């Protein structure tokens, strides 16, 4: 391990901290979503549980390394506390998101990142209908909090969220999941704003 | 990049911590709200939850430089914690505000800050009449708890709450909202207290 | 800002860390009580919910300074982990106190320090007969947890809680509230103890 | 105060972390109970809550000083985060111990250490017959998580579990309640195993 | 003591952080769980908690040492936080984990370490058939979050989840509890995925 504790002093240690992306040198963020389940439906309040896992990909030069100059390391794992993370959020939560999974992300030689918090979100929904055949539908946003589509673009490797999680005896079934990018300018302002579309549609099995 | 580092580097690691706001050098914070949700209204304790956001902005000379000398960088994003911020609070809280949102702020070359927090607020309310067509009125004072008029000035740029992210599906239909900025005096003390009482008439939808 | 750079680093870093009262270096911690809303009681487990601010005021020759020798500077605020304060404490809680309010203190050139901590608090109280036109009392004991009479005196400014802020709408309406200095000695031992009294009779509105 | 810095200089920043007690430098805690208050009983979980204070005492060589070099200081109080603690665990815990009061410790010049923590606890109890006459028994177990009897001894001091602040207006009245060392030895392994059993029988009053 | 801090200071001040296993240098860790209490299940979320302790036990080299050079140590307990811990996660979780216990190890002079969590968990299980005789199945899926088989094996030292510390009056009695390790093999990928299956068949009482 003398290569690895190297390459990680060399990255992190003999190297200043990365500012986070700008206009002149933007970064993409891969999202995916993994739906492990929908918990508890709050009727009178219209707030919606969801425990699901959140892919994240992205790729800073920074975290570059050639594998033969650290005896052909090509990948390491690392606290998510120790690099730069995209500030990626829900835009409709009603609670604060709760963390299920540890805080630790892969590195590979080519500056890739890859990072799958999984988490319990309460978000706005009116479940109305849910207990008949139709089912419901609702969405929800997520984006970066501070960072317009100038710093951050944000795409998905497919519309179809992954149900291959899903828990099979949930109260509610899924019939239906995609994630969805959308761009969108206003008139006043030059920046666009990016995020992805989770929408769900269920009901109760 | 190689001058957003040096900027950051020049003004938070070769630079003093600001100490905050004096009365010979006071600063003034403008407030706006964006209400995205009344959650929840409990008759049997007179409490209310409310999903907004709370636009801040200030200026400090300290967080000034010449984007000339700085590869044209005229802003950039920074946690919230590597910078001083107001302590403004809601003065009829029942809960600790419960924050939905990343803590980073912006930061433009003319020293000027914004800060976006998301939060949950549970605060103090009779919503006897809700269920009526008139609906009820409720408010909550927001203000600094330890700085007075001297040392933090409070604006806002608009008297009308922002309500264009008001959730569609509500239970609660927003009739009314705004937010306005009161000055007050104590007998024993020369210097004026400020706050902006965000004011809001709602009903069941 | 130069000067309360000077003063809170002279202060602060340049001196050592006070180490508390004692029994030969005393000190006097006055209280008073500004109490906001009963928000809740629960006659099924005797806890009633109070929010509420505690004024706290304390003096230490360590926090002089003379303002001529920094820039006429006669006050400033600094987070209230930065400085000594006093480990005031409910005797009969339930629950953990919550902080409605930043830790902020204000510091004055003779040494004072004010410091308004807002907190909801879960005690002891059985309200049977809080539905009558009587009403209820009910009592909650303030003091310090670890320091005697000989180390730390406590005091009032008023006997009469401050009731100008309590919400008006409240489902519970205050008929009494005061706030009173006890001794206790015990046989053991030469030293007292005290505490404040905070004794609150209210019915349903 | 000159000395008391000097003294937790000396003690604290002048001197090595202890790492602990080992079977060459065993170490004795003694415990204690006295009971608050049962705050609530849920019988379709078998959880009780109990609000109690623990006193704690044990004694360090390495917390040792003589007064005469010190300006005859006998004691002094100190953060519990400065100092080494004991791990007692409560073994029977269904949700994390909620702390009530300031987390500060006295220490004596013989190098003895105070710490009573008021607690909020939730233990596995089946409540039935809590409403009889005759009432209902349970039990909690507290010990060292890590340490066995050669590194750890446990004892208690006083004869009684002390019921002299037991709220009297509790849903709950103690009809007994003792707390007593036990030690087990295992035919494999040499060493004790030691808890304090706290045993309470209560009742509805 | 003297040789204890001299072997700590050696193994944690002057080495280096240990980056975690790679497929080069391969972790087992080993799993037991010991049941205290199913406390709770909601039928209309379909969750279940758990109380239990998870044993978990690795070895590495760079904790070796020889006691003759120690003063005899053959082992020491340290703060969990000092040293490396595997990211051992359940996979179907609801809530994040409370933790019940103090986060301290025991390390032995051949490099193993001892670490047992006490914790509750939530986990997605529909208890539909609890009430009956026959009972009710379900099972939570332990693994790493972030390593394949290559770099973290997974075992147990028995397939009985071990119930010597179940709770006698729980609402629900263990029909059976096992603990089984689980290989799988994806066609993409050349990596093992392991976990430990906790299967538990329980009833009400
Ligand atoms: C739910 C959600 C999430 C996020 C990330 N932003 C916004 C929002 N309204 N943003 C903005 N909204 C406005 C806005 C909204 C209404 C009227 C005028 N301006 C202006 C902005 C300018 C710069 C950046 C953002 C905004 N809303
Ligand atoms: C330079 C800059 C940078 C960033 C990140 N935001 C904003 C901005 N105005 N933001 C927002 N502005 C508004 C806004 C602005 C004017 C009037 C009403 N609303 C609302 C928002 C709601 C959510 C998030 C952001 C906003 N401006
Ligand atoms: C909820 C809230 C928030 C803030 C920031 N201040 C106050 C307050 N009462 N302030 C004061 N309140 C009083 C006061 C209040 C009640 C009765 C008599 N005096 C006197 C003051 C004198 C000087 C400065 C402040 C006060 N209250
Ligand atoms: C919530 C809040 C926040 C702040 C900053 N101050 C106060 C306050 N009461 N201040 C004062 N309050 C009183 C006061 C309050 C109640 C009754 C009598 N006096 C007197 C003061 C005298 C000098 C300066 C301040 C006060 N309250
Ligand atoms: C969910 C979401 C996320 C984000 C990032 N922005 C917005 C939004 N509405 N933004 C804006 N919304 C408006 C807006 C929205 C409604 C009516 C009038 N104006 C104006 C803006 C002006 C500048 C920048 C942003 C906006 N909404
Ligand atoms: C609710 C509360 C709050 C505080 C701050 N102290 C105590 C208390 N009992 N203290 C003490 N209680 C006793 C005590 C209590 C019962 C029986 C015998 N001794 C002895 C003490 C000796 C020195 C200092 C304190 C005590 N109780
Ligand atoms: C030298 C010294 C200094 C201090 C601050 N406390 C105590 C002490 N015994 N305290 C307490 N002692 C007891 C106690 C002591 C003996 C028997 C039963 N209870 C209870 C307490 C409850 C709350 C707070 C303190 C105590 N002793
Ligand atoms: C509730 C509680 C609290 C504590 C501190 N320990 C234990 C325990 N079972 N410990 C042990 N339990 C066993 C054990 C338990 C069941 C079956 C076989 N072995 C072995 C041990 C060996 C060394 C040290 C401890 C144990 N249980
Ligand atoms: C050297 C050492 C030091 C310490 C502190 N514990 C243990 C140990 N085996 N502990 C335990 N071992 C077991 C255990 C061991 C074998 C089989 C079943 N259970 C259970 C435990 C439960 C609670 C706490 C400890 C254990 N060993
Ligand atoms: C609410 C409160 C606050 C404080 C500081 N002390 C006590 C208390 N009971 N103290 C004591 N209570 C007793 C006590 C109480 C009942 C029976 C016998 N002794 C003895 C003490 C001896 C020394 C110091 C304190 C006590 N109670
Ligand atoms: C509950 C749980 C826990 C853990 C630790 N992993 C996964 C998971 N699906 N992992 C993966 N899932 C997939 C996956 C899942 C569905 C469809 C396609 N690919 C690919 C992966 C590639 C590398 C590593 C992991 C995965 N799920
Ligand atoms: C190199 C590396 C390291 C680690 C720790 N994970 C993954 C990975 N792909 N993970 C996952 N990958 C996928 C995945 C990958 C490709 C296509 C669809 N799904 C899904 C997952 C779901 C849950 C958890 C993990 C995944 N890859
Ligand atoms: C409540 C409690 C508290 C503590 C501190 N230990 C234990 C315990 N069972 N310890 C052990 N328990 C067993 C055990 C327990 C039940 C059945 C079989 N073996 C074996 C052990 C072997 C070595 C060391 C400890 C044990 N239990
Ligand atoms: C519960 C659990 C735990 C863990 C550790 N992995 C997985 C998983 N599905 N992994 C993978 N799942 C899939 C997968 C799963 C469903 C459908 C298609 N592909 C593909 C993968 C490819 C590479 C690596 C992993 C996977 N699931």
Same mark, same amino acid.
């Given at each position: 391990?003398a290569n690895?504790?190297?390459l $990680?002093?060399?990255?992190? +240690?003999?190297?200043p901290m &990365?500012?986070?992306?700008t206009?002149?040198?933007?970064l993409?963020?891969?999202?995916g979503?993994?739906? %492990?389940?929908?918990?508890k439906?709050?009727?009178? @309040? +219209?707030?919606?549980? *969801?425990?699901?896992?959140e ?5 800073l030069?920074? *975290? ?5 100059? &650290?005896? +052909? #390391?090509?990948?390491?794992?690392t !606290? =998510? ?5 995209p500030? #990626?959020? =829900?835009? /409709?939560s ?5 963390? *299920?999974?540890?805080?630790?992300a892969?590195? @590979? ?6 990072? #799958?918090? =999984?988490?319990?979100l ?5 479940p109305?209908?849910?207990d /008949?055949?139709?089912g419901?539908?609702? =969405?929800?946003?997520?984006? /970066? ?6 710093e951050?673009?944000?795409? @998905?490797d497919t519309? %179809?969220?992954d149900?291959? !999680?899903?828990?099979?005896? /949930?109260?509610?079934?899924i019939?239906?999941? @995609?994630?969805?990018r959308?761009v969108?300018?206003?008139?006043c302002?030059?920046?666009? &704003?990016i995020?992805? +579309? *989770?929408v769900? $549609?269920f009901?109760?099995?």
């Amino acid at each position: 391990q003398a290569n690895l504790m190297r390459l $990680k002093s060399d990255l992190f +240690n003999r190297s200043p901290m &990365y500012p986070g992306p700008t206009k002149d040198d933007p970064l993409t963020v891969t999202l995916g979503f993994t739906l %492990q389940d929908i918990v508890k439906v709050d009727s009178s @309040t +219209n707030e919606v549980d *969801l425990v699901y896992y959140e892919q994240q990909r992205w790729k800073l030069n920074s *975290l570059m390394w050639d594998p033969n100059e &650290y005896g +052909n #390391i090509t990948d390491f794992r690392t !606290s =998510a506390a120790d690099i730069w993370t995209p500030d #990626i959020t =829900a835009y /409709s939560s009603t609670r604060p998101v709760q963390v *299920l999974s540890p805080q630790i992300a892969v590195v @590979t030689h080519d500056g890739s990142v890859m990072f #799958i918090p =999984a988490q319990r979100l309460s978000f706005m929904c009116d479940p109305t209908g849910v207990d /008949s055949e139709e089912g419901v539908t609702c =969405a929800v946003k997520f984006g /970066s909090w501070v960072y317009s589509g100038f710093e951050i673009d944000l795409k @998905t490797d497919t519309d %179809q969220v992954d149900l291959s !999680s899903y828990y099979a005896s /949930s109260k509610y079934e899924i019939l239906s999941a @995609t994630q969805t990018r959308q761009v969108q300018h206003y008139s006043c302002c030059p920046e666009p &704003y990016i995020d992805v +579309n *989770l929408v769900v $549609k269920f009901r109760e099995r």
